[PDB]
């Protein structure tokens, strides 16, 4: 069980690291190779999220039939294929294919690893701690990703970060042989309430929408910032990923503080404050004209997003416990749908908005939306039960 937890933690870490390594590399690479680009990069970045969203229903149907280890190993293989294609491709179509494949492997590994964790551990006190440790590998991967890719892209070329990540994925796949023996076919049983029934509830809609908008505020920022940083003639040496580093660190700091402070303060008020701070900070991003000017707004963005998430995940758990037949994975299913929809709508519309009216107005619109959604958290002050 320790090895399974480590395997799932490392799988999520490598998935998010591969998702975030391309942020400083590909936009600058496609920007340089040219010398409508915004829309192309937006579609390239949103393809992974939309493919993962589409694939999610068809992975549960596979785990319900052949168990967890086979889709886990298939996810690892797809991750290695995507990593190699990222490493060696130099064309837009191949990069799009590599991004799309990452969605299939990410869905496979996330759904099957989380199910395996939620089913192996029988004691709910142990299961909660285990799933907290494993799900924390996503934010650690997001933190590690950008600076590593930026430094290796500046100093030892574009292929090196992806080759190193491919080696890590190979090591994880070799660990799978020692631990799981993916040839094992296992049964599975379905419990709880179907997701489509939960999404019909307006309160779960409020919480999921808050999370979706809070994370879309940076889903749009991921492909657009490395192109807007060309206004400062910014180099890649300790700059293109270190620009995103403060948000990654502040997310961890804010989650650590407010996962404790929210229960005392109130999760609805905590989420409302987080939404307001997110809006204000992404409004304050465009006015910076130096790399040192992005430290405060990115820190605010990460801190407030961590505040919103720490306030909203227990809120969703409490809501599904009150209103429907809850299971250990319902909160993760709702949050994953919210994240996928946010990261799919973000870049796709952000590219068009940036082309039409520019990046500062894109950030202004997103900040206004994130501020205006905050008052809807008042409906979560005391939600009633249903017959
Ligand atoms: C698509 O998403 C991700 O890439 C992950 C991150 C999303 C977002 C983010 N992206 C960035 C990209 C950057 O590029 C340079 C820089 C900074 C950021 C930040 C800072 C803010 N934030 C950090 C990451 C959050 C992660 O999600 C969880 O940690 C999580 C935890 C849970 O429980 C503890 C869950 O279960 C309820 C759960 O359910 C889905 C998810 C999420 O994985 C699903």
UniProtKB/Swiss-Prot annotation:
Compartments, record wording: Cytoplasmic vesicle, Secretory vesicle, Synaptic vesicle membrane; Cytoplasmic vesicle, Secretory vesicle membrane; Cell projection, Axon; Cell projection, Dendrite
PROSITE patterns, alphabetized: MFS
Any GO BP annotation: post-embryonic development
Effect of substituting residue 251 to A: Reduces binding to dihydrotetrabenazine. Reduces binding to reserpine. Abolishes dopamine uptake. Abolishes serotonin uptake
Family: Belongs to the major facilitator superfamily. Vesicular transporter family.
Disease implication from the record: Parkinsonism-dystonia 2, infantile-onset: An autosomal recessive disorder characterized by infantile onset of abnormal movements, including parkinsonism, dystonia, and poor fine motor skills, as well as autonomic dysfunction, including abnormal sweating, cold extremities, and poor sleep. Some patients have variable degrees of developmental delay.
Impact after mutating residue 218 to V: Reduces sensitivity to tetrabenazine. Largely reduces sensitivity to tetrabenazine and slightly reduces FFN206 uptake
Binding site for serotonin: 138, 142, 215, 218, 222, 244, 251, 309, 343
Topology feature Cytoplasmic, residues: 61-69, 121-129, 182-201, 263-267, 321-324
Native species: Homo sapiens (Human)
Position of the signal peptide: none
Variant or mutagenesis effect after changing residue 305 to A: Reduces binding to reserpine
Effect after changing residue 228 to F: Reduces binding to dihydrotetrabenazine. Reduces serotonin uptake
Activity regulation statement: Strongly inhibited by reserpine and tetrabenazine. Also inhibited to a lesser extent by ketanserin and fenfluramine. Reserpine and ketanserin inhibit by blocking the substrate-binding pocket. Tetrabenazine traps SLC18A2/VMAT2 in an occluded conformation and its inhibition is specific to SLC18A2/VMAT2 but not SLC18A1/VMAT1.
Keywords: Cell projection, Cytoplasmic vesicle, Disease variant, Disulfide bond, Dystonia, Glycoprotein, Membrane, Neurotransmitter transport, Parkinsonism, Phosphoprotein, Synapse, Transmembrane, Transmembrane helix, Transport
Molecular function terms, GO-annotated: monoamine transmembrane transporter activity; monoamine:proton antiporter activity; serotonin:sodium:chloride symporter activity
Protein name from the UniProt record: Synaptic vesicular amine transporter
């Amino acid at each position: 069980r320790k090895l399974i937890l480590f395997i799932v933690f490392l799988a999520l870490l490598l998935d998010n690291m591969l998702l975030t390594v391309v942020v400083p590399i590909i936009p600058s690479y496609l920007y340089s190779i040219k010398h409508n680009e915004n829309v192309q990069v937006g579609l390239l970045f949103a393809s992974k999220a939309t493919v993962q969203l589409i694939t999610n229903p068809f992975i549960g149907l596979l785990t319900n039939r052949i168990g967890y280890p086979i889709p886990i190993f298939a996810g690892f293989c797809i991750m290695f294929v995507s990593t190699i294609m990222f490493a060696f491709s130099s064309s837009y179509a191949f990069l799009l294919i590599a991004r799309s494949l990452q969605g299939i492997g990410s869905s496979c590994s996330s759904v099957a690893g989380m199910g395996m964790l939620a089913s192996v551990y029988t004691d709910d006190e142990e299961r909660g701690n285990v799933m907290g440790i494993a799900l924390g590998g996503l934010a650690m991967g997001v933190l590690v990703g950008p600076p590593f890719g930026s430094v290796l892209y500046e100093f030892v070329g574009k292929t090196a970060p992806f080759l190193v990540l491919a080696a890590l994925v190979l090591l994880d796949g070799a660990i799978q042989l020692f631990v799981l023996q993916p040839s094992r076919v296992q049964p599975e049983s379905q419990k709880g309430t179907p997701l489509t029934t939960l999404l019909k509830d307006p309160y779960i809609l409020i919480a999921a929408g808050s999370i979706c908008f809070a994370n879309m505020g940076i889903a749009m920022l991921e492909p657009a910032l490395p192109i807007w940083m060309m206004e400062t003639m910014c180099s890649r040496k300790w700059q293109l990923g270190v620009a995103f580093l403060p948000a990654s660190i502040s997310y961890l700091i804010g989650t650590n503080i407010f996962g404790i402070l929210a229960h005392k303060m109130g999760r609805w008020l905590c989420a409302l404050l987080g939404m307001i701070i997110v809006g204000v900070s992404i409004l304050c991003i465009p006015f910076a004209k130096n790399i040192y000017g992005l430290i405060a707004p990115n820190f605010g963005v990460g801190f407030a997003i961590g505040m919103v998430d720490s306030s909203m995940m227990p809120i969703m758990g409490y809501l599904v416990d009150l209103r429907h037949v809850s299971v250990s994975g319902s909160v993760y299913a709702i949050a994953d749908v919210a994240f996928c929809m946010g990261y799919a709508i973000g870049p796709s519309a952000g590219g068009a908005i940036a082309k039409a009216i520019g990046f500062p107005w894109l950030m202004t619109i997103i900040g206004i939306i994130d501020i205006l959604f905050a008052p809807l958290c008042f409906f979560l002050r005391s939600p009633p039960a249903k017959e």
